[PDB]
Amino acid sequence: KVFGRCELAAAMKRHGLDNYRGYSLGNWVCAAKFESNFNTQATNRNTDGSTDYGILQINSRWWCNDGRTPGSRNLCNIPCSALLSSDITASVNCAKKIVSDGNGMNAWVAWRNRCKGTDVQAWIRGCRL
Numbered sequence: 001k002v003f004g005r006c007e008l009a010a011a012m013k014r015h016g017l018d019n020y021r022g023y024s025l026g027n028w029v030c031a032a033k034f035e036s037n038f039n040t041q042a043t044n045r046n047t048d049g050s051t052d053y054g055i056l057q058i059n060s061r062w063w064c065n066d067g068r069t070p071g072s073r074n075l076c077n078i079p080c081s082a083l084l085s086s087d088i089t090a091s092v093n094c095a096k097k098i099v100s101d102g103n104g105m106n107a108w109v110a111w112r113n114r115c116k117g118t119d120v121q122a123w124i125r126g127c128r129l
């Protein structure tokens with residue numbers, strides 16, 4: 001599914017991401033835009049042989065099992081295919097584990113390079129939330 005900006009903001013708010021570990025909703029929408037272009041089916045392969053999955057590009061090296069990332073962990077305890085669902089619940093629940101992990105949203109390279117220190121409130125402007 002390719003989300004609209006406000007549709008995704010509303011779904012993330014319903015799933016408890018607004019101010020989760022102090023990150024306002026616009027941070028999460030900004031990260032999703034630049035990681036996946038709001039497409040739940042996005043996949044991208046890394047040089048190390050791991051793959052990033054779904055709207056928040058969660059990596060198979062640590063967070064999910066894809067059956068082809070040798071010596072990887074599965075810290076969210078989910079098959080990586082669950083992260084490609086039109087239902088963002090699995091992505092959101094895993095993202096909460098990631099952002100609790102000690103480097104906050106700096107875990108997301110697109111967030112650090114494209115969202116951090118910008119007016120992220122712009123990403124939820126105009127939305128009925």
Ligand SMILES: [Cl-]
Nearest residue numbers: 004005033038
């Ligand atoms: Cl947009």
Ligand SMILES: [Cl-]
Nearest residue numbers: 024025026121
């Ligand atoms: Cl915000």
Ligand SMILES: [Cl-]
Nearest residue numbers: 067068069070
């Ligand atoms: Cl594996």
Ligand SMILES: [Cl-]
Nearest residue numbers: 072073074075
């Ligand atoms: Cl594991």
Ligand SMILES: [Cl-]
Nearest residue numbers: 065077078079
């Ligand atoms: Cl699993």
Ligand SMILES: [Cl-]
Nearest residue numbers: 011086087088
């Ligand atoms: Cl959803």
Ligand SMILES: [Cl-]
Nearest residue numbers: 021103104105
């Ligand atoms: Cl933090």
Ligand code: NA
Nearest residue numbers: 060064072073
């Ligand atoms: Na894994």
